[PDB]
Each structure stands twice: as C-alpha cells, then as structure tokens.
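Researcher: Batch entry, complex prediction.
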Amino acid sequence: VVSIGVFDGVHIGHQKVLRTMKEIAFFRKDDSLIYTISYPPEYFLPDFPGLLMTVESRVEMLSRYARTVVLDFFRIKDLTPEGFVERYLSGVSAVVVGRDFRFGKNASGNASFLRKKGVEVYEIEDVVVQGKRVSSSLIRNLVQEGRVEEIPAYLGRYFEIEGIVHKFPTANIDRGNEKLVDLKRGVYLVRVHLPDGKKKFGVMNVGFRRNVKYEVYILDFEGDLYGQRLKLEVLKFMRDEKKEELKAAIDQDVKSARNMIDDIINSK
Amino acid sequence: VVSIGVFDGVHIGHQKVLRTMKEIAFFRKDDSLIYTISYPPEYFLPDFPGLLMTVESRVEMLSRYARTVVLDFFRIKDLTPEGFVERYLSGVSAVVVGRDFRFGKNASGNASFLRKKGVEVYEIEDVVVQGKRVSSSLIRNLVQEGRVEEIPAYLGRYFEIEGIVHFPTANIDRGNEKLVDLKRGVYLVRVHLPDGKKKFGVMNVGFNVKYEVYILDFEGDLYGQRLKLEVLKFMRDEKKFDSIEELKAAIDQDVKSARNMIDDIINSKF
Ligand SMILES: Cc1cc2nc3c(=O)[nH]c(=O)nc-3n(C[C@H](O)[C@H](O)[C@H](O)COP(=O)(O)O)c2cc1C
Ligand SMILES: Cc1cc2nc3c(=O)[nH]c(=O)nc-3n(C[C@H](O)[C@H](O)[C@H](O)COP(=O)(O)O)c2cc1C
Ligand SMILES: Nc1ncnc2c1ncn2[C@@H]1O[C@H](COP(=O)(O)OP(=O)(O)O)[C@@H](O)[C@H]1O
Ligand SMILES: Nc1ncnc2c1ncn2[C@@H]1O[C@H](COP(=O)(O)OP(=O)(O)O)[C@@H](O)[C@H]1O
Ligand SMILES: Nc1ncnc2c1ncn2[C@@H]1O[C@H](COP(=O)(O)O)[C@@H](O)[C@H]1O
Ligand SMILES: Nc1ncnc2c1ncn2[C@@H]1O[C@H](COP(=O)(O)O)[C@@H](O)[C@H]1O
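Model: Structure tokens for the complex:
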C-alpha cells in the first residue's frame, strides 16, 4: 500500500494522507510505502515560486512516517498510465491519494484507471484550513508575502530556512542549489537550532543580489559557525527591507526581539 | 521626482520611465510619486478599443514602483498648463516622461513649459520593439487580432483577462469598465486560482463578449472569487456548431491540443 505525490513541505493535507496510509496498512496486513516525486511539473517554468524545502530534507520527514522512495521527474515524465503501473506499481494492490491526483504524460491516468489495472485507490477527501484546500502553493505564497505567523495553520509548524554557513555579526545561510522559494524581503524574528541541541533566538534579514540573501544575528551567541549547518524557524515578520544609520535601525529590531521574546516567557 | 501619464498596461515603455524615475530620485535623496490620469481622450471618442486592464489593476502594478495618485481626467482636462502645475508639481524638482508628453487644455502643456516654470523635465527615448514605438494603443490591436503570442514582447508579460466568476466553464465578469476584447475564439490560458494554485485551462471568447474557461484537472466552486488568466496561445476561430455534439467533439478536440502544447511548454526547458 502506497501514497504517491510530491509531498513538498509535507503539509497538513499531506499528513492526513500519510496516516490514512497507516490505516489501510494494518487492516490489510500490508507494509507502507511513500512515493515522493522529486518536482512538480511547474518547477520547470520561470514563474514558479519555489519549493518549501529541499528534496533531501523532504525525504527526512516523509521518512519519519513510512519508507520513502524518491521518484525522479525526468525518469517518469513521459511514462503512460500503463507504463507507470508496470514500472512502479507491480505487486502493489492499493494506493492512497487525494481527490486531485493524476499521473502519466498528459495526466493521462486518474484513479479509475489504476482501479481497472487491478489496484485499489483510497481517495482522501481534501483537507482545508480556513476555507481553503491546504497545498504547497498556498503556503508557498504566505512565505512570499511574509505571512509567517499564518503558516502553522497549514504546515503544522513554522516555515523553515536551513543551510550551510558562510560562502555584527550575521551568519550567512546557503540554502543549497535547489530552486527554493524566498521570503518577502525583510527582518524576521527567528528560532535557531544549533548543533549540540542548542536553541537560540535571533533576527534574520533577507535582501537582494535577482538573488536573495539570508543573514541571522543570533542573540547571545559567540562562537564559530563557519562550517556548521543551521535550521531557523521563521516566527515573525518584524519590519520591511530598508535603505549609514542602519546600525541604529537593527537595534529597533534587537531591542524589539528581546521584547517579543520576553513576551512569551512571562505568559507562562 | 514625479512621472505623469495614463500608463494603461504598464508596458516596457512605461517601465523605462518608472525606472528612470526610481533612479533620478536616488541621485537626489528625493522621493518618487506617480500621477496616473484615469483615462485618455480616446476613451470618450467613437470606436475606443477599451483599456487593457481596469484602473484598479493598473494602480496595483504602478504601486510596486512608488506612491501613486489618480487624477480624474474630466478634472485636469480643463486646467491650463499653469493651473496643472500650480495644483500638482509645486516644489517638485524633476519630472520624468518621454517625448510627446503633453498636458492642459488643448495640449498647450509640454516639456518646454515645465522647464520655463522651473521644473526639470527628463524625457526618455521612445522604446522600440521590432521597429515600433511601444504603445498601449498597439498592444490593444494585438489583443484584438488574437496575436497574444507577440504580446509579451511589448507588454513585458502575458496579456491578462481578469474578473469575478458569475465540461463546466467558469464565467468571468471582467467588470463594468471599458476593456479591450480578444478575437472571438479559443485560447490556451494559465489560471491563477484564489487559493494560490496555477492550473492550465482553455478559454473561449464568443459573440457584449462572453469569457468562460474550463480549467484542466480541477474541481471546486469559484462562484464569487476572482481569477487572473494569462492568455498564452490562440488555438481556433469561435465557429458555429449546428449540433450540440459537434461542439462536445470540438471542445474535446480543443482540450486535446491543450494537453499536448502544455507538454511542449515543459519538454522545452532541457
Ligand atoms: C537584524 C538585522 C536587520 C537588518 N536590516 C536591514 C535592513 O532593513 N536593510 C538593509 O539594507 N540591511 C539590513 N541588514 C544588513 C544587511 O543584510 C547587511 O548589509 C549584510 O552585510 C548584507 O547586505 P549587503 O549585500 O548589502 O552588504 C540587517 C542586518 C541584521 C543583522
Ligand atoms: C474550450 C471551449 C471552446 C468552445 N468553442 C466554442 C465554439 O467554437 N463555438 C461556440 O458556439 N461555443 C463554444 N464554446 C461554448 C460557448 O462558449 C457556450 O455556448 C457558452 O454557454 C457561452 O455561449 P452563449 O452565451 O452563446 O451561451 C466553447 C466552450 C469551451 C469551454
Ligand atoms: N552571534 C553571531 N551571529 C552570527 N554569526 C556569528 C556570531 N558570532 C560569531 N559568528 C561567526 O562570524 C561569522 C560572521 O562574520 P563577519 O564577516 O564578521 O560578518 P558578516 O555576517 O557580515 O559576514 C559567522 O560565519 C560565524 O561563524
Ligand atoms: N474545472 C472546472 N472548469 C470550469 N469551471 C469549474 C470547474 N470546476 C468547477 N467549476 C465551477 O463550475 C461552475 C461553471 O459551471 P457550468 O454550468 O458547467 O458552466 P457554464 O454555465 O459557464 O457553461 C463555476 O461556478 C465554476 O467555479
Ligand atoms: N489539502 C489536501 N487535502 C487532501 N489531500 C491532499 C491535500 N494536499 C495534498 N493531498 C493529497 O496528498 C498527495 C500530495 O501530493 P502533492 O499534491 O504532490 O503535494 C496527493 O495524492 C494529493 O491528492
Ligand atoms: N515606448 C515608449 N518609450 C519611452 N517612453 C514611453 C513609451 N511609451 C510611453 N512612454 C512615456 O511614458 C508615459 C506613458 O503615459 P501614456 O502614454 O499615457 O501611457 C508618457 O509620459 C510617455 O512619454
């Protein structure tokens, strides 16, 4: 029994499907297999916002659920429905998908098809947080419009920026090379997970050059992060990206951060 | 600094103007301000093709460049050049526009006037594309011939139909403004759904004019939500079908080419 799809971000509508995968599992005595497609057709277009995380990262969550097998978009973009079943669904007798799920050169095959190929399709009806069908798209935008405080209602958690370092002080994050989405330009209140389990707060600014840069000033930290990797949770969108008195502006933020922080701490 | 004119479509011409503004201003630690004249004289004359987008849409885009302010046409329409200057340009150093920029009753207002009155007018050379001065007027003719493929070249992006929604086909209410109509026929389009998803779809214009799109791989009520539709390719002439089925056939023959062209649009990135 397997659920197919991209699963980018692995949102709440995603987790729905995965769990139902566990159900149809037990009551079938079968084992579970997630089939995560590398990229959506869109990815290969200019106006594509971006992925919410790297595939490597996505197969970290998808994994913590079932056994994930990544399907390469190049390798399957021309396979026909029949071609697909044969090369990827043999032996399997049931899939878990959503009301939309299509597949095969020209979306040639719906669930009906798979049914007529001797396979059971358990369609999970759409999940919707506040009037809209959760989706990577929908989250892909709030990220663009700086609406971070609005993401947990869809992502099941805070949006995250993560990468290798270098390449005030501020740490420069290299989110890798995949075509990832970028946040509205600006200053953000962030939660930093450092090595050794450390979770320090910080402020992160995002600016141009075309390109977008990610720099965080981690509060109360004074060590070397040059080579290290980091995972930052974007909690709040503080202020917009501005204009030699900048060293004076950041303090608005820092002194501000310290305050938003202490806000929670008190509200036991 | 300040820029003036209608700005219907905000095409590459319009952009060179707004970008020059955005610069002439940094060179001065000055501030931008766009004055968009709601309409153009033709708008109220026999046979006006209509605008490309609603004034609201238009302000929307201009907004990303700088503070925008709309001026009723009917108002400044009568003002004399000094009048106009006395009401809007006061204490404003620079004014970015391009050749052929005029203002005031009977167009007596021009760049020389602003200059003689202490304001620095920075004309911009007309932007040519394939031996043509980019113009809101041009683009309109294209839309009208269904030559939507040639549009991005001048317009700087894909022509776009929009409105409120009022196999199944969504009925777009473009609005009550006077907008330009496409050649009646069938088009491949790219839909921008309320939620945020972008599905391909196929639109048909026929006949005022009626616009209805059948979005590919999609199901859900949209009655009441807005849709922006990038018009990507012209496929066929909206013809008469004396038998319902001949239509069902055609419509399906349309959705077929749709699907393939789409495969083309992607197998063309590697
Ligand atoms: C909390 C924080 C807030 C910042 N806010 C801004 C800002 O609003 N505008 C800006 O231009 N730079 C800001 N910066 C700094 C730039 O990111 C900094 O100049 C960096 O070196 C990269 O910018 P650069 O490529 O222009 O040199 C901020 C830095 C920090 C740590
Ligand atoms: C892709 C697509 C192509 C269409 N092509 C035509 C066409 O060539 N001729 C036609 O009369 N109707 C066509 N239709 C249907 C009309 O748009 C339909 O009659 C609709 O109800 C509006 O037309 P009406 O106002 O005359 O009823 C097409 C519909 C779709 C979705
Ligand atoms: N509190 C801190 N926040 C961000 N980086 C720090 C901090 N403390 C030490 N560093 C280190 O210093 C580097 C930033 O160096 P520097 O060149 O001085 O500034 P910039 O951020 O402009 O590149 C980081 O790569 C990191 O290893
Ligand atoms: N894939 C789709 N394409 C077009 N409309 C759809 C689709 N799915 C659902 N709809 C909805 O169906 C309605 C259009 O219904 P229909 O009566 O069949 O078309 P029309 O009256 O324009 O010929 C709209 O409210 C629209 O939001
Ligand atoms: N919001 C949602 N509600 C229900 N099912 C969903 C939702 N979002 C995704 N799915 C299903 O989960 C799988 C997700 O893959 P993808 O759409 O590529 O992210 C597909 O089989 C979808 O139908
Ligand atoms: N193709 C072009 N190249 C350079 N400037 C242009 C072009 N088309 C229009 N402009 C300028 O941009 C402004 C556009 O206003 P309007 O002509 O009303 O749309 C006027 O001040 C024109 O001089």
